[PDB]
Amino acid sequence: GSMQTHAARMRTFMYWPSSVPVQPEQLASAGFYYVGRNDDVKCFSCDGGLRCWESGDDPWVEHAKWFPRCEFLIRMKGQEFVDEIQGRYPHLLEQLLSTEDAVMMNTPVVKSALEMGFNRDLVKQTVQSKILTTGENYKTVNDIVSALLNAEDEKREEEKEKQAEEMASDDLSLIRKNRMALFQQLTCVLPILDNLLKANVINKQEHDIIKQKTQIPLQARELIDTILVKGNAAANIFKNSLKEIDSTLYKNLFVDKNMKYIPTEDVSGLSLEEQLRRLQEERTCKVCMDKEVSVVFIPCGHLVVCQECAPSLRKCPICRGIIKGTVRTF
């Protein structure tokens, strides 16, 4: 409970990057403290996490958009304020679970940025991200110019990073692009799982985690995501094993590259609770391989980690998307 006081939260912002336009006082008053990496913050009350703050962001409003049941928020701002924000920006989370001259590229603000010479693709990615993470486009030219400059710097950093780490193989990329189709169509889990163990790509604890799931499809999605997290060596074992197990599936995925996906139902109509129930069922944190998954990444919408492991990740292990916030699954 050490972060329950305003004074304690302010002290954490000692390390806060001075260039972020959102000031420590605004964040701390809204219940957030600095977790110590980048510009990641968490609420002391609800444990909601938000990152990648931009000019014009109001911490109270973002708090209510994403964490409307937080007791601190409700006490400080009132239920009316929370209902108001939820009414203005409805169903932000559910939209994440559902996931070229668009309307968003043609507002006065965005045109003003384009007319200054900002790269059009950069503007598109930055605008798209803004809408998915906040439910709205840029409000002023000063805000978008500041966000675009920051986005340019992040892209440069990403370059250096991606260029210093081992590149994803073709095989890993293929598995990643066909994640959902494989969740649906892979039924031969154990031979592949045994082979990952024998290759020391996974250990016995991790082997047990996947083998003990109670239904084939539950085992299968744990296997696939574990592969995506472990990386190139796991993808290679998967590919080689599949060949011997199911020639038709191997061919579809790695040779003809013609897998067809089709959902049995549009869960998009189910309640948020039920969508999360299904997404979370017998899913184990892919980082610690011990605790249950209990976090949804914003804005990619993936369920991959527990609450203790989330703060350690800059990017989603599944899709490599930059994580801009974390919400609890229950």
**Window contacting Zn ion (CB under 5 A); options: 100-108, 138-146, 156-164, 289-297:** 289-297
What is the C-alpha end-to-end distance of the chain, expressed in Å?
Answer: 21
The answer to whether the annotation marks 63 as part of a ligand binding site is yes
Sign of CA dihedral 226, 231, 235, 237: negative
- In the complex, least distance from residue 256 CB atom to Zn ion, rounded to whole angstroms: 27
The answer to whether the annotation marks 43 as part of a ligand binding site is yes
**Window contacting Zn ion (CB under 5 A); options: 50-58, 205-213, 241-249, 318-326:** 318-326
- In the complex, least distance from residue 105 CB atom to Zn ion, rounded to whole angstroms: 24
The region that residue 198 occupies, defined by phi over 0 for left and psi between -120 and 50 for alpha, beta otherwise, is alpha
Long-range contacts of 158-167 (CB under 8 A, 24+ apart): 166/231, 166/232
Candidates 3, 22, 46, 276; binder of Zn ion (CB under 5 A) is: 46
Whole-number Cα distances in Å, 1 to 8, 47, 70, 78, 308: 10, 12, 15, 23, 16
Candidates 97, 249, 253, 318; binder of Zn ion (CB under 5 A) is: 318
323 is a site residue for Zn ion (CB under 5 A):
no
Structure tokens at 115: 């007319």
- Tell me, by CB under 5 A, how many residues bind Zn ion: 18
Report d(CA 141, CA 148) in Å as an integer. 10
Candidates 68, 302, 303, 326; binder of Zn ion (CB under 5 A) is: 302
Q: If you count DSSP H runs as helices and E runs as strands, how many of each does the chain have, helices first?
A: 17, 6
- In the complex, least distance from residue 298 CB atom to Zn ion, rounded to whole angstroms: 10
Cα angle for residues 162, 166, 172 (degrees, 5° grid): 100
Q: For residue 126, what is the DSSP state?
A: H
The answer to whether the annotation marks 188 as part of a ligand binding site is no
**Window contacting Zn ion (CB under 5 A); options: 53-61, 128-136, 184-192, 301-309:** 301-309
- In the complex, least distance from residue 326 CB atom to Zn ion, rounded to whole angstroms: 12
33 vs 67, beta carbon nearer Zn ion: 67
Binding-site residue numbers for Zn(2+) are 43, 46, 63, 70
**Which residues of the chain form contacts with Zn ion (CB under 5 A)?**
31, 43, 45-46, 67, 70, 285, 287-288, 291, 300, 302, 306, 309, 316, 318-319, 321
